[PDB]
Design an enzyme around this catalytic site. Structure first.
Site, short mmCIF file in Angstrom:
data_model
loop_
_atom_site.label_atom_id
_atom_site.label_comp_id
_atom_site.label_asym_id
_atom_site.label_seq_id
_atom_site.Cartn_x
_atom_site.Cartn_y
_atom_site.Cartn_z
N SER A 105 0.82 -1.22 0.00
CA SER A 105 0.00 0.00 0.00
C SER A 105 0.86 1.28 0.00
O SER A 105 1.66 1.48 -0.91
CB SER A 105 -0.97 -0.03 1.19
OG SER A 105 -2.13 0.73 0.92
N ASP A 225 -9.25 -6.79 -3.48
CA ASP A 225 -8.74 -5.63 -2.75
C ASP A 225 -9.62 -4.41 -3.03
O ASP A 225 -9.74 -4.00 -4.20
CB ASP A 225 -7.30 -5.35 -3.17
CG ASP A 225 -6.64 -4.24 -2.37
OD1 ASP A 225 -7.34 -3.42 -1.73
OD2 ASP A 225 -5.39 -4.18 -2.39
N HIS A 253 -6.69 -6.75 0.66
CA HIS A 253 -5.62 -5.76 0.59
C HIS A 253 -4.33 -6.18 1.32
O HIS A 253 -3.32 -5.50 1.19
CB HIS A 253 -6.15 -4.43 1.15
CG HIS A 253 -5.19 -3.28 1.03
ND1 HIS A 253 -4.70 -2.84 -0.18
CD2 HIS A 253 -4.67 -2.46 1.97
CE1 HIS A 253 -3.90 -1.80 0.02
NE2 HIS A 253 -3.87 -1.55 1.32
#
Lengths: 274, 274
Positions: A105, A225, A253
């Site tokens: 991320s 995700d 995710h």
């Protein structure tokens, strides 16, 4: 929790930086996500033993996170540049060269940033559900209700985990740790500046920047995700000519947490350890 | 060439079918592409030894190809159904159950077809540069000049290989084999009916059919594949909910030939042998 790892600290250009490490051999650095109370151990604890069988595996806390210095956002700007420069500073302070690097991320944003600015430090890059082509408009684009409007409760934290993963059921100790982590006064204000900045500026690099990466790249993403949609991950695969792409089904995710063995297998293989 | 493998034959509902096999244990069936003179050994020879260390690996020639019966297209319709039913017939004739299955291109169409019609025969499915969402319009959509207008010369065959792969340099014995294979009078007419049918009807299954697959699926494609564009492969990854996706960089239409070890590694891993 996580006392199996020794907490270490090193100065990174004025930023006292928390990290844990395990194993020996070639260096592998793991960069955590941008969630509330996110840190190295909560993101990567589960992968540490497998990685450490093959490499010296290192997870640190980004500036404004975990047990790293979170300079008062009354005087410090929590930009992407700051995270990127901090990572670069961290790699140099430990005297590592030609590392393997994995970012999830916002950790992916940071890994990508360090790979662009200081390619000489990084042999292998893994971008995992990475926020590297996310516009301001994208930052506010329902699936993120539990995240966006987190109320600071334990039930709210369970709702975040449920929204960010496909079928993963955290233990009570994980829930408790993440919940408390998200409320630390130290990193509260730093996080709000971090998120404020990200919402306003986005987390991205230009198509040309993404095509300019100079080392081998592996791009990973969960098909389900909701924070970094799989189509964004697909876009990264196509934007970086040399990038290997791997899409995980029934996966949200947190690839490293949801499929820890498959994650370790694909990355170690890409690192030449399998 | 390829005399290291014993040529075997078995009747498949009136179609005498050529196959080669190596190794022991769980069955793995490999389905070749739809190119001129394509067959089991020219597609998969290189992967046989690695596969055979772990499984009983089998490559057969589709109806209208290689050394399998090519019924006169004056009396036989070379539809996708015919290839699909032939594969099903082949699996049953050898008495295999719960197989692992890999198809390249038109072999992918066939593997997908057998997986839909006879799922009880197939435990694991790999679709590799697979023609499973290719419309008639797509069949005529420049990059394929060397293929579309092949003149039957050795230079023309080298041009096909060059157009269908990224940097792969075939040996002279491979060039000679493929060139001669493409000129076999036996399979000439069968191939023209095969291609005529494919151009007219396309090689595809509906989005709903692709979502209806009942076993685990792995989708593979080369990023530089000009025959089955990577975006088509991406579409397959997204259309089949359970599908794992793996995109190979610097790679054309022949993943198994261009990256034989990586191909064997990813597939064997997905088969649970690594």
């Amino acid at each position: 929790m996580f006392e199996q790892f020794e907490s270490k600290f090193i100065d990174c250009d004025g930023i006292r930086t928390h990290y844990i490490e395990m194993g020996e051999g070639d260096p592998l650095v793991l960069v955590h996500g941008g969630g509330a109370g996110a840190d190295g151990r909560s993101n990567f604890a589960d992968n540490f033993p497998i990685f450490a069988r093959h490499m010296r595996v290192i997870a640190y806390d980004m500036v404004g996170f975990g047990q790293t210095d979170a300079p008062d956002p009354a005087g410090f700007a929590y930009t992407q540049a700051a995270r990127t420069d901090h990572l670069i500073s961290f790699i140099k302070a430990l005297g590592l060269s030609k590392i393997c690097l994995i970012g999830n991320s916002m950790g992916g944003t940071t890994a990508c940033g360090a790979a662009l600015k200081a390619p000489e430090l990084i042999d292998r890059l893994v971008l995992m559900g990475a926020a590297v082509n996310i516009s301001p408009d994208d930052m506010v684009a329902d699936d993120l209700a539990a995240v966006m409007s987190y109320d600071g409760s334990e039930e709210g934290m369970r709702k975040i985990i449920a929204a960010l993963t496909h079928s993963y059921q955290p233990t009570d100790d994980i829930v408790h740790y993440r919940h408390e982590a998200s409320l630390r006064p130290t990193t509260t204000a730093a996080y709000k500046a971090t998120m404020g900045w990200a919402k306003q500026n986005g987390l991205y690099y230009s198509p040309e920047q993404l095509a300019s990466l100079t080392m081998p790249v592996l791009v990973l993403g969960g098909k389900n995700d909701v924070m970094v949609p799989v189509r964004k991950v697909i876009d990264q695969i196509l934007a970086i000519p040399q990038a290997i792409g791997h899409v995980f089904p029934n996966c949200g995710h947190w690839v490293m947490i949801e499929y820890p063995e498959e994650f370790c297998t694909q990355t170690l293989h890409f690192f030449g350890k399998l």
